[PDB]
């Protein structure tokens, strides 16, 4: 900055910058519903958090990484998991569930300590998960499998999904209520001009 | 299998297999506390789930991916995040938190549909997170930064962490109560011998 330069020789914020008019004007890095849909469609791993009763009787969350598929027409995401707790902290046949899908890029170095960061694209989904049965379960497991293994066809590449398979597997539809989408994918973190610049080890 | 071979020409479970005596005998793919510690030490991204009050008054979980560091002597993990809800579904100055760290490898194809899987190593941590202040916060942010950017030194590579930095940042210590560790990192999924084997596109 001038003040520092001049001090050596003896704000930023409101001053000119380039802006691409095509960029999102939404606060807090937020993204469009179309962007969220496309991120969900290309992802294959998610974390799901649901609530279980703990030892003190209080609800607490599990976090389970698992394969998933977004089914846009049905308005859900499907996954299977045999991970359970004792009792769900939940009244009813479905349970509230949060699901997260992200694309995490590179860590971004800076000579400014609070500008250290990582590239990310991230979706949070809020809804109700329910266990599927029978041909509902078989269809969801098929969509899932054929999604995460492109080119695989259940019944051809693999034997068909049998009744025994289904008895041994808990398959869920997370029916979507709300979602959120956030991206910060800069190529370089904000740097501090008035401190020695990072060397080529860092940015090269 | 014989039965199928013979049927064409016209159990597995209890029969001989190789076992490495060095392998974990724990059920459900579980791992030692030493293994959990080492996984936590090499990781740099975690998800944290904490509970917020929702619209119907019920608690529900957020899932936040963030940079983290395990501090074994202190018995905690530290991270910063400005993500908040309305009110935490929580009595007190700390809040219950679950933290997840995983290494996710390749998706593993099979001609058996319920053997489709993905390689993973995964830790679940259960504890109480509390906001840090002052030199506690500065030290934790330094450990974090110098962990996720090896070779970076706060105060040298970057300007020091200032009081303004600290006012703008919520830095947490998740004090560990319990943890869990799980691994399934096979090189190949279990296949079904009595269905056409996968072609070289899949396993080659
Ligand atoms: C710990 C874990 N990481 C990935 C998975 N997975 O894909 O089933 N798992 C299994 C349990 O959710
Ligand atoms: C959505 C997201 N993905 C990664 C991050 N991050 O590293 O801060 N974030 C930011 C908020 O947690």
Automatic annotation (TrEMBL), chains A, B:
Q: Where does pyruvate bind?
A: 80
The annotated regions of Basic and acidic residues compositional bias extend over: 11-23
Superkingdom, taxonomy of origin:
Bacteria
Which residue stretches belong to region Disordered? 11-30
What InterPro entries does its record include? Answer: Pyridox_Oxase-rel, Split_barrel_FMN-bd
Positions of (R)-lactate binding: 80, 145
Q: Sorted alphabetically, which PANTHER family does this protein's record hold?
A: 5-NITROIMIDAZOLE ANTIBIOTICS RESISTANCE PROTEIN, NIMA-FAMILY-RELATED PROTEIN-RELATED, FLAVIN-NUCLEOTIDE-BINDING PROTEIN
From the Swiss-Prot or TrEMBL record, give the protein name.
NimA-related protein
Task: Please give the organism.
Answer: Deinococcus radiodurans (strain ATCC 13939 / DSM 20539 / JCM 16871 / CCUG 27074 / LMG 4051 / NBRC 15346 / NCIMB 9279 / VKM B-1422 / R1)
